[PDB]
PDB file of C-alpha atoms in Angstrom:
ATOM      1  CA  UNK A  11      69.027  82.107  28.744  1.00 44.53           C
ATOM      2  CA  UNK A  12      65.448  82.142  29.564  1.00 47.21           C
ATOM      3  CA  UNK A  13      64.067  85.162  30.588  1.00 48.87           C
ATOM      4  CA  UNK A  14      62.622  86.475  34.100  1.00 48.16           C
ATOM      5  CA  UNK A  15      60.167  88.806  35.705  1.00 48.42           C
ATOM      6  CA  UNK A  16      60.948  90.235  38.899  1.00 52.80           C
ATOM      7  CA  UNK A  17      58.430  89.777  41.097  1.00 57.00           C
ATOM      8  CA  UNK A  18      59.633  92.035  43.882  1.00 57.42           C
ATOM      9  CA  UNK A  19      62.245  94.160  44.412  1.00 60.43           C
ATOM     10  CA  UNK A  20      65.368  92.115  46.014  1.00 62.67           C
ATOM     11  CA  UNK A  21      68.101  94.112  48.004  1.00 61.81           C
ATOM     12  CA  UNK A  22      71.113  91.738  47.591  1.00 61.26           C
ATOM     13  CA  UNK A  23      71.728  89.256  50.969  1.00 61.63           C
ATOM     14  CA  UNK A  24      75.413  88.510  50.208  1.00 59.88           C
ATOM     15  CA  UNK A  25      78.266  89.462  48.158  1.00 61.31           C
ATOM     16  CA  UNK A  26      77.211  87.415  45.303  1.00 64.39           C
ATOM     17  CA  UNK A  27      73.523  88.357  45.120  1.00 63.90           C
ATOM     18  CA  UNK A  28      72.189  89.891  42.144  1.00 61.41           C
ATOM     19  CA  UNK A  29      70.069  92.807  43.569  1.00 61.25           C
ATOM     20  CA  UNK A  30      67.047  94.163  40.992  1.00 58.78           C
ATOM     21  CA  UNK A  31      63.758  95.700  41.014  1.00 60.68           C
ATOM     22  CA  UNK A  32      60.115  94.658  40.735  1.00 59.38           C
ATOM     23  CA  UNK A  33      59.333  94.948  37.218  1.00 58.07           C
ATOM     24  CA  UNK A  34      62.727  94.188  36.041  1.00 58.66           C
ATOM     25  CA  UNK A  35      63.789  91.734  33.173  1.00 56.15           C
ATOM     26  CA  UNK A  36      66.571  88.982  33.778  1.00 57.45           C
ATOM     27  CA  UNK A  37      68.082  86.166  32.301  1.00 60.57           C
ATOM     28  CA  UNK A  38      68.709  82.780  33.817  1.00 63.42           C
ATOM     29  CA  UNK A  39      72.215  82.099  32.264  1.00 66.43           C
ATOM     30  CA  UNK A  40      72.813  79.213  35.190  1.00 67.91           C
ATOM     31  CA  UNK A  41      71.151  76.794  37.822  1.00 69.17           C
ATOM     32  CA  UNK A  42      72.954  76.266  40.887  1.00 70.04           C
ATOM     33  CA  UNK A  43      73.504  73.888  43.623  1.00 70.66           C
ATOM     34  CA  UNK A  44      70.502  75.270  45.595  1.00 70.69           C
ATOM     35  CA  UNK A  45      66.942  75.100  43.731  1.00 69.54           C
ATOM     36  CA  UNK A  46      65.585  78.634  45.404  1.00 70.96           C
ATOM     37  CA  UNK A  47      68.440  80.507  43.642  1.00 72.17           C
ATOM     38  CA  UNK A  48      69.970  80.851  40.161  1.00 74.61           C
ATOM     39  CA  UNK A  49      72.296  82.382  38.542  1.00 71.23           C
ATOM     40  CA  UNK A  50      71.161  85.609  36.184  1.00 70.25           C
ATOM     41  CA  UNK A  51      72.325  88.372  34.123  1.00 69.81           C
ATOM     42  CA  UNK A  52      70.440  92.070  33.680  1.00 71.94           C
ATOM     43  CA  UNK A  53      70.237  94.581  31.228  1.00 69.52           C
ATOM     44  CA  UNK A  54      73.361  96.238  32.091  1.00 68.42           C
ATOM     45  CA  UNK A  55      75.424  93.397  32.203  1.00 67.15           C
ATOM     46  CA  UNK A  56      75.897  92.800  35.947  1.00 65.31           C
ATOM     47  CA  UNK A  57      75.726  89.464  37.227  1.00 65.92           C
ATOM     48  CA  UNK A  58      74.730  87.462  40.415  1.00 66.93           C
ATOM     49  CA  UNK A  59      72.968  85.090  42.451  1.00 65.83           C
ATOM     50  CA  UNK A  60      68.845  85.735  42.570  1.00 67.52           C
ATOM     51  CA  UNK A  61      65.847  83.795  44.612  1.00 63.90           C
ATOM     52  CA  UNK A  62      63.839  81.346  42.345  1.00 67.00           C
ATOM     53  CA  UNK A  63      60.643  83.096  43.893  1.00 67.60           C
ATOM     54  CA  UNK A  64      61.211  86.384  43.346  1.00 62.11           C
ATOM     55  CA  UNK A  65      61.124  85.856  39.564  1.00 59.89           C
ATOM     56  CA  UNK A  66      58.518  85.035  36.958  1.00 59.29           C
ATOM     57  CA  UNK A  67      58.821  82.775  34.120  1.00 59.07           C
ATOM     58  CA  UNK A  68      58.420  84.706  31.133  1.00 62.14           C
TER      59      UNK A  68
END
């Protein structure tokens, strides 16, 4: 997985959504059918759907 940057804090929209705060570190483990989201993983464990743009590469 390839590791994220939150950008900005992201309350979750739907029941899938990964919520998170600025600062916080994420992997990408997927890509999904919609280019502005993917798929991550946190620290934790928890897993969900995240905006593209909320996240920095590395």
């Amino acid at each position: 997985g390839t590791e994220c940057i939150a950008k900005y804090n992201f309350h979750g929209t739907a029941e899938q959504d990964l919520p998170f705060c600025k600062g916080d570190v994420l992997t990408i483990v997927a890509v999904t059918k919609d280019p502005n989201w993917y798929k991550a993983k946190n620290k934790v464990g928890r897993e969900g759907i995240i905006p593209a743009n909320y996240v920095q590469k590395r």
